[PDB]
From a paper:
Here we identified 2′-phosphouridine (Up) at position 47 of tRNAs from thermophilic archaea. Up47 confers thermal stability and nuclease resistance to tRNAs. In addition, we identified the arkI gene, which encodes an archaeal RNA kinase responsible for Up47 formation. Taken together, our findings show that Up47 is a reversible RNA modification mediated by ArkI and KptA that fine-tunes the structural rigidity of tRNAs under extreme environmental conditions.
To find the structural basis of Up47 formation, we crystallized [name] and determined its atomic structure at a resolution of 1.8 Å using X-ray crystallography. As observed for ePKs, [name] also consisted of two lobes, termed the N-terminal and C-terminal lobes, which were connected by a hinge (positions 96–109). ePKs consist of 12 conserved subdomains that fold into the catalytic core. [name] had subdomains I–V in the N-terminal lobe and subdomains VIab, VII, IX and XI in the C-terminal lobe, but lacked subdomains VIII and X. The HRD triplet in the catalytic loop (VIb) of ePKs was replaced with HGQ in [name]. In addition, the DFG triplet in the metal-binding loop (VII) of ePKs was replaced with DFE in [name]. Although we demonstrated that [name] is an ATP-dependent RNA kinase involved in the formation of Up47, we observed a clear electron density for guanosine in the cleft of the two lobes, which corresponds to the ATP-binding site of ePKs surrounded by the hinge and metal-binding, catalytic and P-loops. However, in the guanosine-bound [name] structure, the P-loop was dislocated from the ligand-binding site. In homology modelling to ePKs, ATP virtually bound to the active form of the ligand-binding site of [name]. It is likely that the P-loop and other motifs form the active pocket for ATP binding following [name] binding to [name]. The electrostatic surface potential showed a large positive area on one side of the [name] structure. Instead of the missing subdomain VIII involved in recognition of substrate peptide in ePKs (mouse PRKACA), the basic surface in the C-terminal lobe might bind substrate [name] through electrostatic interaction.
Author numbering: 1 to 216
The structure:
Amino acid sequence: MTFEHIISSKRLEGFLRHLAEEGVGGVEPLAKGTTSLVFTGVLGGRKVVIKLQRPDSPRSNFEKEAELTKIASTFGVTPPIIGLGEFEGLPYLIREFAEGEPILFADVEKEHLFRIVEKTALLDRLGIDHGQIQGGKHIIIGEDVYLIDFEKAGFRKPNNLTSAMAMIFIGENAISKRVREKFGLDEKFREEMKDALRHYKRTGSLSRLLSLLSGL
Ligand SMILES: Nc1nc2c(ncn2[C@@H]2O[C@H](CO)[C@@H](O)[C@H]2O)c(=O)[nH]1
């Protein structure tokens, strides 16, 4: 993948040199987002992600995403921010790369299920709706569980926990099928899960959900 309809070849060359001067090497394109161009690199012997404002996107959109990403980083929901910068008037952020698999492709253990609850309930308590839980590409299952990529996030009544649990336990998809077979989940479990989620929606209580997952 290349970014040539968005940045000149000279701008890309300069950006890689600029990153190299901050110690970030072996930089490779990773994705094109709605707000940003995303790269991976190596800093201090470890993998990092670099997100650069797309010049053809509003700067305010990137700034909103960055503010939300910083809050999520402070509370541990997303991997730590390592540094901020600006190149040719474009802001960028550098964060740790979380080793592991997106939950769409991940082998999910009981500890991961508890951790997914803890992270999504925490983001709910922060009043931040991530916005892209469905599809399983934005929850990383690794040494810890993380949410990534806040381009569609905002301060609004959040759906992070309910969307994650519906995707894993209620909806029929590749993830929920794996989980159902791995944990031998049956119809009674699903009905209790629906009850646990309703309870959470009404009261904010995790008691019923954690009770149910503790039986796995
Ligand atoms: N394992 C891992 N994958 C990532 C990370 N950041 C971005 N990605 C990949 O990029 C995609 C969308 O950003 C994800 O679904 C992953 O494949 C990360 O920190 N860890």
